[PDB]
Each structure stands twice: as C-alpha cells, then as structure tokens.
Amino acid sequence: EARDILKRPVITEKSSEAMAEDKYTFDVDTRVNKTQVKMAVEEIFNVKVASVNIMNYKPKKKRMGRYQGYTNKRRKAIVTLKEGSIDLF
Amino acid sequence: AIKKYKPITNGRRNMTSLDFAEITKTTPEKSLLKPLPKKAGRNNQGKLTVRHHGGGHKRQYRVIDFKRNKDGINAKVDSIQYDPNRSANIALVVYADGEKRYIIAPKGLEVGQIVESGAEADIKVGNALPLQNIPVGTVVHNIELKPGKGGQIARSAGASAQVLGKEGKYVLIRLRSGEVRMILSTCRATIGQVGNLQHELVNVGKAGRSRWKGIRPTVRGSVMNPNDHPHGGGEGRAPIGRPSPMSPWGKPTLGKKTRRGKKSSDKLIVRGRK
Amino acid sequence: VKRTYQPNKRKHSKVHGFRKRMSTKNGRKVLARRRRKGRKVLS
RNA sequence: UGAGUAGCGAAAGACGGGUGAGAAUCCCGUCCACCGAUUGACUAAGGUUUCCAGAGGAAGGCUCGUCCGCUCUGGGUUAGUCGGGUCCUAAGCUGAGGCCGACAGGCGUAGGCGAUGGAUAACAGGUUGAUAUUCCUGUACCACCUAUAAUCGUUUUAAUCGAUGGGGGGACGCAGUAGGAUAGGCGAAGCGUGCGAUUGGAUUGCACGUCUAAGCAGUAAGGCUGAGUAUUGGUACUCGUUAAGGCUGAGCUGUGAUGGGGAGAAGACAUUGUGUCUUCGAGUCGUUGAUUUCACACUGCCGAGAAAAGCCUCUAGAUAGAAAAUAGGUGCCCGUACCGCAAACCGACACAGGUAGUCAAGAUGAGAAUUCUAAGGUGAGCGAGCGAACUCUCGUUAAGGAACUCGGCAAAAUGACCCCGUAACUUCGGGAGAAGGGGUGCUCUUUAGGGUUAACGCCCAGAAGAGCCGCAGUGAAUAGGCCCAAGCGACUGUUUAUCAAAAACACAGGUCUCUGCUAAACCGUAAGGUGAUGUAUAGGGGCUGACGCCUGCCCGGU
RNA sequence: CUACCCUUGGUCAGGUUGAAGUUCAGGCUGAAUGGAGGACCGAACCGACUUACGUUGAAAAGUGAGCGGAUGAACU
C-alpha cells in the first residue's frame, strides 16, 4: 500500500529550491489523504515527518494533431521532515 | 376612542384610527407564540384559488383557547393585548396553579378580575359554563356547536347572541345575523359581549393602508375582454347586457341562493335571516 | 439590455441533470431516447 | 458585378534612445494630456488555464507588428483557526406505514434534505517570475488522547455526572433624538531634507512624527427600585422610590506582546559598475475640529415585527472518582491560479449596452451637487494632408421680436445666498419659492455676539462707518420662467418589454347580494387543499368611485 | 426573459416644511418644545414625457440634452 500511495517525485526549479529547505514534493494517488501520505513516507524512507500539505490539479486541454483531449488530473503533496534526508538525484 | 387626523396631506385627509386605550401591555407572551407564514390564496397545487390576497405585514400567531376546559380553578386577568390575527382584543389570564393562556377579551373586563369556568360557576362577565346552566335572556358569546370542540360562533369584535328557550336537549338562541337556531344544550358559552366595539368605525384612508393588511386590488368585470369575464367588453363603456349579472366563472351573482339542500342542520334552523 | 440566459451552476444541475431526469418516467424516456440515438452526452 | 467603392466601433499626443530583414503602431526615458462617489482599490456570481518564463510570426488582431488574452515548449494554486462539509433550522422538495386513483400515477404522517439567516478557535512581519491570515519567523488560541499529580470517599448520597424531564435564553419591526469613545481630516510644528542664479527674500522651501491578535489591569455610560424568607409559573411577609454599582452586561483607554519590526533618512560599501546592500546610527510632542463606525441603548408609533441548535440553569436518576494544572502528543475532505462593473461574464464580435455588495482623500460647498487636483490608473488597434459643396455637433450676430408653425417644436431666458413684500379662493392644512422689489468684490478703522475660549483673540464677524478698482463683484461651472382662464380625472400610484402614459386601470368611501361553519366561493377524477389555524364589526361576487348637495317616474316583459 | 407570489437579506448625499402631544403666559389664543407625513426640492438608484441623432446602426430597441419618482402601494 505504501509503494502504491507514492507514485513518483517532482523535479522542477520550485521543487528544487524547496529541497534547499527540508521539503520534498511527490505525486500521489488521487484518493489518499495526507495522513496516509505521512505514514507512507515514514515507512518507505525511514525518516521523521514534521508536516504535509496537499493540493489538487485539474485536467488541462491539450492537442496532438487535430485531436482535442485532456491530461490526467493529479494530486501533489509536499512533505517537511524533522530528521533525516531523502537521497535522490 | 376614535381619533381623527388633520388633513396635512391628501392621503390623510379623511383617515381615522382608534386609540389603543384598552391595551395595557404592548408586548406578547413568549411562551404562547407560533410561526404563521403567509399563503397568498394559493392551495397545495400552488395555484391561486382565492383572489385578492397578497403580502401584508408579517405576523405571529397567539395560541388562544376557545375551549375553556380547566374547571374549578380561578384565573386572574393580567393584561389586555393587541392581536393582529383577529378583530377583537385578547386577555392573558393566570391560573391559580401557575398556568397562563389567552382568551378573547369581553367588553367590560378589567385587570385583576378573577374568571372561572365549570358548571357551578357564577353568571358574571368572563365565565364559561354549559348552555344548560345559563338562564333565559342572557347575552353570551363564543359558543360551541359540538360539545368539547371549542367556541365557533360570535367571536368578532362586538359580537353576541342571547338565549331564548329550552327544548329537551336543545336550546333556542338568536345569532347576530338575526337567525334563530337550536344548539345542543351540552355546549359551552362565555358570558358577555366581545369588546373593541369601535373597530368598525375606522376609515382606512389611503390605498397603501389596505395593502399593509394583505389586500390586493380588485379589477371590475366590465373592463375585461370577452375571453376573461362574461362582462367582457364591447365598444366604449357598456351596460350589463345580460338578463342577470354574472361572476368571473359564469354563474348568476345577484339574488340566487347557494346553500345546499338536504343538510343535516336543516331541522335545527327555526327562522332564517331576513 | 438584459438578455435571456443568465447562467447558474446549481439551477442547471437541478432542472436538467441526471438525478432529476431519473426521478420521473418521462425523464427516463428522455435518457433512453438519447441512448438509442447514440448521443455522447446524456444530460 | 456593384469597386479599389462604403466602412475601419466615442477620446491627445510629441520627440530622443534601443532592437530588428523590415517600426506612426514593440521596449526604455522626458514632457504633455484624461478619469478621480472613479477609467482607483476589495469581495460575490459567471467563465474555466485565459495566469508565469523562454521561443515564434502562416492564420486571428478591422492598418502594421520585432507584439499579444494567438502558436510551440516547460511551469504555477500549500490552511486545526479563511469560505463550505463531519452543526441548526425557513420557504420548498421528498416521505416508512397510510388515503385516493382505467394504467401510468396524485396526495400526505413521523422522519429526512434544504441558506439567502443562527452557532463557531490567528494575528503581525519576511519572501517568489508565477501562491499566501495557507510557505518562513515571532507570538497565540480551540478541540481531542495519554502520563504526572493535591481535591475525589456505600456511590443513595456525597464532590461528580444526569435526562427525547422542567425552566430560561438564543429572539428579531419602523422612525427620531441627545450623547461617550474611536477612525480619519486640518493647523502649529520635534527631527530630517536643502538654501535656489530671472527682479527680490532668507525668521525659507518641503516633509515624517508608525506598529497586531492574544494576555493583565480599569471602564465613559447602559439596564434591573433591588435584595431575603414560607408555601404550592402563582399566592403571604421584611429591608423599599438607596441604586448606593447590590447585580448584570459595556464601547474604549494604560502596561507589556515590542531594548522587536518597520522607518522621512545613506550618512558604510571592498561590493550586488558601485545601482544594491555586508555592515553600523536615529524622531516618536502638544492644538483643533470629529464620524455615514462602535447600541433598535433611549423616546415614540401601529401596520404589531422567523425557527431550531450551540448556551445557562434545577432535576428524576446513575457511577471508583471526577477538578483545575504541568508535560507531552494528535488535528480529515472540498475551494484557493487568473479576469471580474470587464478584450476573459450575458449580448454571434477585442461590440458606445446589461451585471449584486464593500472602501470613499484636499480646495469650494448644505451636499457623495459643481470645477480643479490626490492615492492610483489611462492615452482607447488605422494613419498623413487639404481646410470644397453637402450632412452632423458647437459659438456669435445689425434692425425687428412669434411676423415662423398644425402647435413658441427647438433654442433663448429664470436659477445660488441674504433682506423686504405677497392675491383670488379654500376641505382652514393650503395656495406660496405666489406674484413684485432690493443687495453681494477688496482694504482699513470702530464696534462686536457666538464669545473658540482664560479672552478681544479661535472663528462666522454680530454690525456700522470711511476708502479703492473694473464694462461687469454667487465676475468661472452647477442650481425654479412666471401669470390669467376653461375641459377631464379627487389625490400618491398602475399600463400596451419593442409606434398609444392618457380622460384608460387602482384607490379610500358607498351600495346590492350570497354565506350559521365540513360556510358560501374556488382548484382537483378523487384523496387533499385555499378560504382560515378566520366565525356575520367575518368571508366571496356585482356595480359605483375622495368630499359637498342629492339621487325623480315605471314591477306590463325578462 | 417576463407576470404574480413565498422564505430570508440589503440600500436610499443633502436641504425644506413643522401635525398630534407637552410646558408656560395671557384670557379660548400666543410663545417655547416636539418631530408626523403613500409631504416638498434635489444626487445615488428606479423609470421613459419631448426632441435631435442613428435606420446594410457602436446597438435585432441605443446615445446626447432636458424630464417623472426618489421613507414608500419604494428599489434590489
């Protein structure tokens, strides 16, 4: 369930400047609440989580050659931690 | 009791109102009030079935007891009060055990006077007792038609009826309308006349005052179109143009009787209106 | 000049809209009629 | 085809520099102009990525385009306290059983759902290209859980808790008045700035003088004539009109929160080509006038002005044993970008239209009117010439002054403030701003009330004289033409969205008639409803239409 | 959209007039006080009377200048 709650990390410039602090950004399953996210991070990465914020993103319109559609909707979570650090690249 | 206004304005030129000198308290009793949302003459289908009922002032309902079934206990009168839902004033009484309720207020009622109901009560203004125990000739109000149901006759401001005679289990009585009728002798009634006798002398004065009371205007039938009303118009003004005036629904409306035949109360009506 | 059609999210979902159409027999007729035509949007 | 014709959708731009293949149209600078009870700043609906950065110039943009609300690529919305849900109910909608009905189905009881209302714990500063009461720093508050504990003592009782038990409360209209505070405005100015090159002055020009929730103290007035006893919300007694605060509530003020933050200032940068900031310094006064904010508090009136929960109390009754305090912990879901009186909403359009609420500076004034400005925003997505006829919008005009025309249609004229004067008629209120006259700037004396106030002084002068200037003194803008006599309708109101606003409709008043209550009347096949939680001083229908004086003859016909 | 209604909310710069009532004075009327009204004048706001313009419109009902109501049978 823990490997199914967290989907992948987000690597952008806003997320990197946040990682300058102790904040890490994830894309998570669109059905979970922030308590599940908090407990999943602690189990997978073996750290101590201080807080967690979440937000929802709508689907966007997009084209590929006269084919109008939508992207997937997504859920984003930002995890502040007290002790430890997550190794990424 | 009737105060006249000076003609400072054309609207207030002949207006009249009654001063509220009988009222002794201007705030109702919180425990006996209930909500009363308005219906503008519209039934459970949502359609308008009675004309000319509209949006007046907001009102609360005072719970009045027309039964008077607490017997053998005295009640002392506290105050006379205004009631928006009827033409008579009301009085708040307090029973010896501490209960309060409203009754319609009779003509010569005063604060502090004690009032009583039962079969052994005395013949004095305010008392309620069965018609069997009321001597002939008494003036009486708030009469029942089925024993224990509550008073239904003679409840307007200044209304009264008087007892005439006695049959086996019925009592003769003359109503304010002028008709004489038999009423079951097990039915209660209250002694006296209903107060606020000046109520019908008021001159309303302006169109807006009757709109404050929930009355919307009335359009005459002869200024409508033929598809709207039997008096639907011709060219210019026109006479009635028929053997008899009609209603908006095409039925004669001047002189024709509408009481239904074969009613059970036919045998109780001794003499009708004249 | 005020035009007809002043939009409103709640009014639209309550007058048209799936549950309202399903609450009567003649609304279920509409839904079946649009299914038979192959229409992409039902209410 | 009409034809290189009509149009290019309200308005002020000019020049220098830059970039580019290409510039009236893009970027930067200076000057000029327009709005400013708003073309400024917030919040809703509605829209749904239009938001930001880099790249682009085929189509869209009424011209151009290097630009863009357009195309490509990649990004952006963070909540225990903000608005909803895990709270409450209104209208209304649904409704287990139930009632009715060719079928389909209609109604309705308990109960549910349903805000536009009731309840409800967070503020100041910092920071990004794009979010912030959400992130960061500081300081708080509210629920819930477990430990550490004084008080806890049969669990009747006792502390405790306690009812689908009782009582209170929440809890309410409209108008007016006199106040208390505070916000904001204005003038001296306690410390900052700089001191002029066109004649002159320097006692002179310009400005700032801030700062939260929470916590502690006290407190301007407000309400209750208050405060005990015995008995069944009520009845008898004592101190009473004291209000002393006895009690209850109550705006606001002082401390600290904060030797902190920010700050008119640079005066400290090696630098962040010196910009920006490493860094180090600093002021928090007294006057005046004062709400449209903070009480339906108080007084008055008739048309007599929601509910339920949260909340406070007394209980039947129950149980070790529950109290505050300290220390730890825990705190979900949805929305959050951007436009938003509009180039993004409703109008087919980058459309002179329509779109709920909040904030509201200076001079002048009664004013949110008028003209010019502030804070802030904007220069309108075709231009350059020439100054033809004709059309539109605007100004002036000799002599005459309605001769025009269906008709003074349109225009002109009146207009603010102060003083004087005011008819017929009348329902005695009115008519009335009737008509008709006169005055107004600036300076100096004398007086001189409100006396601003300690006071002439603060300030309108409260007023009288004596002077000066012009064609003209409410020198601009804005601000009633009036009178006489007849129809019609008493009056305020209403009407043919989009050719008729009226003499038409309403109306207060009058009169006739039906209706004794499961009322008559009306909707419905019925059940069920309105009438009405009303009861002849009431309810339905017809005609007339304030008020005054009145309302004649005919009952053969229907 | 529009007509009527139901429940629950919101808005109306300023000036003017001076009803009941009350208090004194005179001898029933005079002065103070008071603050009524489908009252008056006039912005916001709501309307739509006259006129000019527009009529392959800026707009499939508008704009400019005057104009009616503006505490109420008000507007939203």
Author numbering:
A (entry chain R): 2 to 90
B (entry chain C): 2 to 275
C (entry chain 2): 2 to 44
Give me lines lifted from the publication on this model:
The ribosome, a macromolecular complex assembly consisting of ribosomal RNA (rRNA) and ribosomal proteins (rProteins), translates genetic information efficiently and accurately into proteins in all living cells. The large ribosomal subunit rRNA helix 68 (H68) is a key element in the protein synthesis process, as it coordinates the coupled movements of the actors involved in translocation, including the tRNAs and L1 stalk. During translocation, the L1 stalk shifts from its so-called open state to its closed state to assist the release of the E-site tRNA from the ribosome. These L1 movements are coordinated by rRNA H68 (3),, whose sequence near its base is highly conserved in bacteria.
Aiming to identify such rearrangements and following our hypothesis, we have conducted a thorough cryo-electron microscopy (cryo-EM) structural study of Staphylococcus aureus ribosomes that were incubated for various time durations (i.e., 0, 30, and 50 min) at 37°C. Single-particle cryo-EM techniques were applied to identify ribosome flexible regions at 37°C. For that purpose, structures of the S. aureus large ribosomal subunit (SA50S) and of the whole ribosome (SA70S) were determined after incubation at physiological temperature for various time durations. The nominal resolutions of the SA50S subunit structures were 2.65, 2.48, and 2.73 Å for 0, 30, and 50 min incubation time, respectively (SA50S_0, SA50S_30, and SA50S_50), whereas those of the SA70S ribosomes were 3.11 and 2.86 Å for 30 and 50 min, respectively (SA70S_30, SA70S_50). Nevertheless, H68 was clearly visible; thus, this helix could be modeled in all five EM maps. In fact, while for SA70S_30, the heterogeneous three-dimensional refinement results in two identical classes with H68 in the original position, two distinct classes can be described for SA50S_30. One class accounts for 79% (144,826 particles) of the particles used for the three-dimensional refinement with H68 in the original position, and the other one accounts for 21% (38,658 particles) of the particles, with H68 already showing the rearranged conformation. After 50 min incubation, both 50S and 70S show two classes with rearranged conformation of H68. These data suggest that the rearrangement happens faster when the small ribosomal subunit is missing.
